[PDB]
């Protein structure tokens, strides 16, 4: 994640998460020994067991292994993701428009210059998006255009294996929404699970029958079902088929999107900690991975033209990236304000970066000082810890800023 | 399916079908040339071409594969549905319990006397059934005991694998049951598509216009959607997953479900036809697997307990049976009545078996003079063709056994 230079560097086991330590990250790891220019020598030490030891010197003495990229379809694979997802970006893009192209293109990857089984890939790859018609086959050989389903996908950045899932779900969302409450906006949104915490089901089960009313109402909808939840209570719950694989799945999606539901509301972090077991990373991870996700849902739902979706998502990509109630959506403009300090700054007051611009340092100032509770009280992303009156001033300043450049 | 004694039994071709004959087939076939006790020696020709004298000698010199069991698994299989109705059959029946007693059942089966895995075999079985709580495990070894949804599955000698989805189909019906008409409940005892005959599916999207709403209600509940139905008359539509093969299942059941209404409603199979694109014996035999399949789920769901399912399932089986309105059900009681025997006594007064065992035998035979419309007028599928006289005499004296039976 980050360079940190320091003169010893202790790995205590060789075995990481029930595994061999993967020599790309040893190297990482041990690579880290030495402060630069403080240092005559960096040290490492593995800490290893007599039984490790094996394992131990294979991590000292073994090098990286070379590089082999994922277009090779393996064995029972017709067609890939990665290559679904290059032929797509070529064909509704239009820089490649036949097959004589599509092999012209594929001679320019990795893949061929590793080998130098594709040609056909391609065409397979070709087929999926066909019969799908994220591309439509005109007569010329064949020439190939998108759908609107086709250019939804390479405008979202969305995967066209799980865009068929998405489309059929927005549409099912469409033919009856319920906008009593964001609850059923956020379901949609909420990321697939990729096991972001450990879900406790007799929690999540006993926050179901508190959940209200108009949040039931949305689970109903979108396929939760109290009898399965006490079938995940009563003990282990598996998934042999696909049939079994989705119909997990949208309980896990649900509980992430109670939990986003509370993060949109400033629900204190260690307060849905208590309330839902997840730790504040998981939590935090989870929610730029979902604004994340927000941004894409609103750009795939605007080329299709489901412009009374775009309305309602489009707002959710800023206000859970910063986890903020629709007010202080305009404040967080200025980026030295996270939702607590937007959050102090409205409550005296400045609802808006117009009134924050006109606003005196020195009245931000006490703001400040007074609603927080020298010494770099303040951490700011971007910077080193800032005193009161630096961040005061900076804040207006940038607010000023924010108008000039939006006038201009 | 017959004994037809021939004196010639020709065979236009080598190739059946789009492929050879099978051995069995064709001495199916041959065995019936030579009429018993009136010819000399029975002839068989099988004309060839010079393409197939090849193919042709084969078959005359040919002999049958030796039989061989079905719960012989598979390369890739881990269970077959044969093994799991076995191993369900004797734990829900109770006739073994433990483990030691389901290897003791196997080794009496054919595959185990063909083979004087398996062991293994039993294993995978009761572990899917386990898993989804056809049985439960208990502690003794463990002891394995049916739940209700095992003891439903039985009793209505429905397939386990399939019950799972009937099983969420019935539950999800009775979250909302549109008893406006009889379609919704068509729906659910239609049997799964068994290509009983190709659909024009250019005819049934030009019926899912003129469709009543109270039966486009039911197909919004089931399932049916009209974006599919445009796409399986813009072209073809194909399955790469199980997701895409109900899909399309649901609405090939629903198609099924309206040719079963129009049964149900005594319309003719000469309008069936021409409405519907079937042929009599494809409609025919379609009344016979949605009458056995209508007897399965009302068992189940007497089982499992859905007495308003059953109360309104139970009267099905018969009404398929015969293809007939809800009060010729107790006219039609008399086996020598069908539909068109049944609709004119019911139309000339005699609404009920009591008031037709009554009946003046002479009235009868009017009746059927006048409303069929001495060579055998009518025929009894249990019987040669009967006059008028004879057919209405034994209709009145059946009738009458059967108050006898009903008292008794």
Request: a positive charge.
């Amino acid at each position: 994640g980050v360079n940190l230079p320091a003169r010893r560097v202790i790995i205590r086991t060789p075995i990481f998460g029930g595994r061999p330590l993967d020599i790309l990250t040893y190297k990482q790891m041990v690579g880290r020994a030495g402060r630069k220019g403080v240092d005559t020598v960096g040290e490492s030490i593995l800490i290893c067991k007599n039984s490790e030891k094996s394992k131990g010197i294979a991590l000292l003495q073994g090098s990286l292994k070379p590089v082999r990229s994922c277009l090779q379809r393996r064995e029972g694979e017709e067609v890939t993701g990665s290559m679904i997802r290059a032929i797509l970006e070529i064909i509704v893009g239009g820089v490649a428009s036949t097959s004589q192209d599509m092999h012209t293109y594929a001679a320019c990857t990795f893949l061929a210059a590793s080998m130098k089984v594709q040609l056909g890939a391609i065409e397979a790859c070709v087929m999926w998006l066909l019969e799908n018609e994220f591309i439509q086959s005109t007569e010329a050989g064949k020439v190939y255009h998108p759908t609107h389903l086709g250019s939804a996908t390479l405008s979202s950045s969305l995967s066209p294996a799980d865009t068929l899932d998405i489309f059929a779900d927005l549409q099912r969302a469409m033919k009856g929404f319920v906008l009593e409450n964001d609850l059923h906006i956020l379901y949609l949104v909420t990321p697939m699970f990729e096991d972001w915490t450990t879900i406790d089901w007799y929690r999540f089960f006993c926050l179901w029958e508190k959940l209200p009313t108009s949040m039931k109402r949305v689970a109903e909808l979108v396929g939760v079902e109290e009898g399965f939840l006490a079938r995940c209570v009563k003990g282990k719950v598996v998934a042999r088929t696909e049939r079994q694989h989705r119909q997990m799945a949208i309980h896990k999606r649900f509980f992430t999107s109670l939990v986003l539901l509370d993060l949109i509301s400033e629900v204190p972090l260690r307060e849905i900690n208590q309330k839902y077991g997840c730790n504040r990373g998981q939590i935090q991870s989870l929610q730029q991975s979902a604004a994340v996700y927000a941004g894409m849902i609103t750009v795939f739902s605007n080329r299709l033209g489901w412009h009374n979706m775009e309305l309602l998502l489009s707002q959710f990509q800023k206000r859970l990236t910063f986890g903020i109630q629709r007010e202080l959506c305009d404040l967080v403009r200025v980026s030295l304000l996270n939702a607590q300090r937007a959050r102090v700054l409205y409550a005296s007051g400045f609802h808006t970066v117009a009134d924050l611009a006109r606003a005196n340092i020195v009245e931000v100032e006490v703001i400040l000082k007074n609603a927080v509770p020298n010494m770099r009280t303040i951490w700011v992303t971007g910077r080193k810890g800032l005193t009161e009156r630096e961040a005061a001033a900076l804040i207006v300043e940038e607010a000023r800023m924010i108008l000039q450049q939006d006038l201009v």
